[PDB]
Amino acid sequence: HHHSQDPMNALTTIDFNQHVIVRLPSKNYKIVELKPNTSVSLGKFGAFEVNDIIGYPFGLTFEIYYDIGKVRLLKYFTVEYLSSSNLLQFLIDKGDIQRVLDMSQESMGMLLNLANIQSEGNYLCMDETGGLLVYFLLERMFGGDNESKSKGKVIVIHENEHANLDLLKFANYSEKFIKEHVHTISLLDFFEPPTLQEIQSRFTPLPRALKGGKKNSYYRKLRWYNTQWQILELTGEFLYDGLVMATTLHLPTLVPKLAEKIHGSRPIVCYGQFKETLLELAHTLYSDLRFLAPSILETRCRPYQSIRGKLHPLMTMKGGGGYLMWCHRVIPA
Amino acid sequence: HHHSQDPMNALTTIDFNQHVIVRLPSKNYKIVELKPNTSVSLGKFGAFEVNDIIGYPFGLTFEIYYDIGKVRLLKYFTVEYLSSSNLLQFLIDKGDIQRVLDMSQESMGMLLNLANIQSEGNYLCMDETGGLLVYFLLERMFGGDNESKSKGKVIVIHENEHANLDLLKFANYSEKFIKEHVHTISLLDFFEPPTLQEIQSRFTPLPRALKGGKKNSYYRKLRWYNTQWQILELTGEFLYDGLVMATTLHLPTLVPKLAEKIHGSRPIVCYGQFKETLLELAHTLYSDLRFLAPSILETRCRPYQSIRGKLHPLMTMKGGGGYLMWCHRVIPA
Amino acid sequence: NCFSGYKDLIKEGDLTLIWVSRDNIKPVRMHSEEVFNTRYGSFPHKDIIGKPYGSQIAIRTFAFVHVLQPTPELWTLSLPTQIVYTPDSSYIMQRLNCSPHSRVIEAGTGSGSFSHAFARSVGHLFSFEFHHIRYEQALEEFKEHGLIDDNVTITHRDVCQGGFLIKKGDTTSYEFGNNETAASLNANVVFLDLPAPWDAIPHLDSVISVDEKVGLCCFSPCIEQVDKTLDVLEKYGWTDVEMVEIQGRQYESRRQMVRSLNDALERLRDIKRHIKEGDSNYKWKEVTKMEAEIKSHTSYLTFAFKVVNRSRDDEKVNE
Amino acid sequence: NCFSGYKDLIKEGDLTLIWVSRDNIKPVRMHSEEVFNTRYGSFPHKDIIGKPYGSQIAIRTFAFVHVLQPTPELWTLSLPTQIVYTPDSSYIMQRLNCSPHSRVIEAGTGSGSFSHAFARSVGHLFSFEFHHIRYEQALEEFKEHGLIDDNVTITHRDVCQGGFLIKKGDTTSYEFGNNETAASLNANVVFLDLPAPWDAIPHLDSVISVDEKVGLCCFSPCIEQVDKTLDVLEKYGWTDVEMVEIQGRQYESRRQMVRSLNDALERLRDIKRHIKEGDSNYKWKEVTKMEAEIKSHTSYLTFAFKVVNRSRDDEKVNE
């Protein structure tokens, strides 16, 4: 803002203070924060100055060479946008596959379309991964644009007092963006919300001219009050445009309760690492007329060694990738 | 035997009175019995005289042409040996996939090797398919040779009063061969066999010179007696060299009872159409120290359109193929 | 776009998807005087209009349908070759990171299956159709669905011979702005579903974004086609090239009867002395059952990326 | 052949496979003075010899092993490239209808994995090894296992340059009968695992059976190799040509904890006022879990068949 020149686009361009992906020659990923006037170490592959890569587009490979080395366009490294795909891959490389419930890129990609995820939708979500699912949703809805004019929201229902959304610290989202597009509510506040009466007995607002400590003790209470009021708005007769879930809670006695707040004709997608889990859910939903034709889906990707003359699928790879339970909320006659 | 010339080899050569496979231009199979001086109809693809194809090797394609047509080496048809593979494929073409419990060629091929099936082994078997599994076993052990000197046996344990082995009528096995290599025993006779005392009270043999009706009423009773004696030999302290199963009976409370008659270090292979079934069994066997490391295996075949210039996997095919539960009988310390 | 957003109530004139069964989904435009017929009965529209989307509709001699708002996934299942199904398309979109930031080139339009999935999330879609009659049909459909008035452009073009430029005078739905004589495609996402994608790739340099990573996916049924594609991609400077296949499966939730040894024994003891799935008179085990027929191959997916201006503004960084 | 038949009791001098864990199976020859060491303890052989095959053997400071009779499947799992695993090999054997009727040509011998599976069921096995040092090792192993004295022949040979004929004077285990100067291979089953199988296929006409359907499988990692194979097969008169791939998966039987909504609620109510798998203090759901790493590609399998004498004895049929 203090520059006369137009800002750099961090969606297209390597920019200061962005969290960014770096692919090493060994093909594993690192996440790197681009603090001005600092250096970054890649162990055996050398170190480089952050300033020397700013302003380039993503997808380029830089060589580190020595007369902390210098960088030129091509040991070496490749700099990529921190996409939902790349974040998942980083977590897998890091060894956290069980923390992401064994999910794959194709399974999450399918979940996004089965769930009909759109910029203007309000989606009900459970995410036990630390926010990876939330991030897949947000990146598809807004593309990482903190200035999006779209009004869509992800409402995260969670098991503990607070939601675990720690992965969003890598997302390059402003606090404003997050507050506008992500709402969190515990399972207890969602299924047994406080009444307006119960809320008011703790605080009712004043009819602005406050100052000092009085202004600050008041707005903290008013903050609590607005939180409570948000819960009222989200738990009333409010109806959501879809339900997406990656939780290890017991689905057969959880999903029917969540689906009462979903509008008719909206998709429901439950991700699960184990098909037997979804099988039990599908049978439970078969006998509930509020659910249309629950289906268990599986998608698996097999890459090829893609060099001309020696074309063949990869000979080994990791198993897993999980399964999707897809169905639609409907209204019985 | 009344020919001075050496007989034709029905393993290598199209021969009279053999059941044989015919592949039509539409690629579906028919089973054809080659009765001398008869004709065979293939509907829209014409009819031909059995005599005109005898003596050729298997694997040839014949054209039917007209001046009941004549045949020459190439509408058309291909004549193949009735192998265990081809019998399965015929049943699938015929639409009987559920009668064969959805099994595939690769799953049965794997079962044969996991079970270490050998010419001299005595194998315990359950087969609800009408004898397809029994036939896979017999063909691997003896190769269709009714004069094999090998001594191996398949002992079929079955649910009803008699075993359903009706598919063996297509097998081109003599009654002698079958009687020498296949024994049947009901579940009740296997788990609660009659005693020697109970058998003798109904019949004890005479010390040969009988004749007429006396010789014939005696040998019928002696036949019953020998059947009972065979059961005694197979249910005592007799131990088998392997257990192979394709049944839809409840496996967790059946397999431990069957495995008591299996020698230490012998494989156990249970085929199942549904993995959830085998999963339950594997957990049951985990806590029984008589079973070593039960594993659920899956094998799937994907053919390619194999024409040069347009190479790619088949675009559609049937799902299924089933699963194998593999483990070894062991002796706890 | 009647595929986009979230309608509450079914209105006269609305395009709906009426779910009859899993393999039977029909697109039906509501009209108060019309009737929807299935092999199970007749459903007058006036008994549907005014009810919420997702309503189960019942008639006696009871038969049912469910009336749904169109979505790309359900639309694709309703269609009767040139079809990209959801396992392939959702993967392609995820791997190329589709979002409102995306500007995509699609050729050819084919069934329009992929076009509807793109349109839902992309900033803009530029679709190209070779066949003049398929072009006209796709145009009329995209217009009726509301795609053309939102974020979709379709153009009649042999992209292998004539490239991707959109100029005034061309057969196209494109609405030219003030002082615009040509569209600036500025594509950062390219999907090619063509007989010979390697003839089209050379034309991409004129229409792709030049200051960002551009992603490309080529959709080809045969390995020989993949081989020719890998070759041209290398020649025209595309990197991070990788071919993959996607395999999708669907399972039914079913039950197998529990049949014990003891009951088989008891039946044999009796001999010695002388059904609908889920039936509560029996015990059942839950099992998953694979779809009868599987799509064991749709196409090989070849992904590639390009950056044209492999440079930075050195002095603008200095400031 | 110590892989064949069914031994009751473990004997001094027996080759055994000692199962330590799923990924740890070791071949061990029993000797009364020797000891078997694992990372869990020491197992003296004299405490094993004389016990039945399949015995669990226990020691305190309790640790266990299981002592098994060798089989081709367990042997293959015990081995440390050129390995054909059971999903591929069992399929190949089934599709080519292997039985005592089979006479097979295998080239190359590779790890000997396939050789042991063949030997168990075939009439005779003719195996060919290119490398003189691998030949000698395979020969010594096949001899020790008892294969050479049963139904297996191994020959040192570059089959692509010198073909498959076995003549007196050749480097081979083959035992020539009376008046035999050359083996009559008379092969009806051929398996080729070679860098360039298309150089070997032309030599097959001299050694395959001429009056029966001969089956061939070529094992090649790359699609380009498949393409060259399809070409030569056609030129040398092989028909019913089909390439397939086999995919094997293995699953663990596991359990996931059942965690109810109600218990999550009760935990949140408490907040408001202010573990080994299978643990019987909890509820569990049985689940299958895929092996951590999968063999997503071993090789393409190209099958083909030939009949040389495409004729019958017309007059012998007349009689």
Numbering used by the authors:
A (entry chain A), B (entry chain A): -6 to 60, 80 to 86, 189 to 321, 326 to 451
C (entry chain B), D (entry chain B): 4 to 64, 70 to 88, 91 to 284, 332 to 376
What does the article say, verbatim?
To improve understanding the target tRNA recognition and catalytic mechanism of the two component m1A58 tRNA methyl- transferase in eukaryotes, we solved the structure of the TRM6-TRM61 holoenzyme from S. cerevisiae by the SAD method using the Se anomalous signal. The final model has been refined to 2.2 Å resolution and the details of the data collection and refinement statistics are summarized in Table 1. One TRM6-TRM61 heterodimer adopts a rectangular shape with two arms protruding from the core. Previously, we have shown that a symmetric unit of the TRM6-TRM61 crystal contains one molecule of TRM6 and one molecule of TRM61, forming a 1:1 heterodimer. The TRM6-TRM61 holoenzyme eluted with a molecular weight of approximately 219.5 kDa, which is very close to the theoretical value of 196.6 kDa for the TRM6-TRM61 heterotetramer. In the structure of apo TRM61, loop β7/α4 and loop α2/α3 lock the binding pocket for the homocysteine moiety of SAM. In the structure of apo S. cerevisiae TRM6-TRM61, the residues 88–188 located at the N-terminal β-barrel domain of TRM6 are not visible due to the flexibility. In addition, the arm insertion between β10 and β11 of TRM6 in the apo S. cerevisiae TRM6-TRM61 protrudes away from the position that is suitable for recognizing the anticodon arm of the substrate tRNA. In the tRNA-unbound state, the TRM6-TRM61 holoenzyme likes an open hand, which creates enough space for the entrance of target tRNA.
In yeast, the two subunits complex TRM6-TRM61 has been identified as the key factor of this methyl transfer reaction. In this study, we report the crystal structures of S.cerevisiae TRM6-TRM61 holoenzyme and TRM6-TRM61 in complex with SAM. TRM6 and TRM61 adopt a similar fold, with a high structural similarity to the prokaryotic counterpart TrmI.
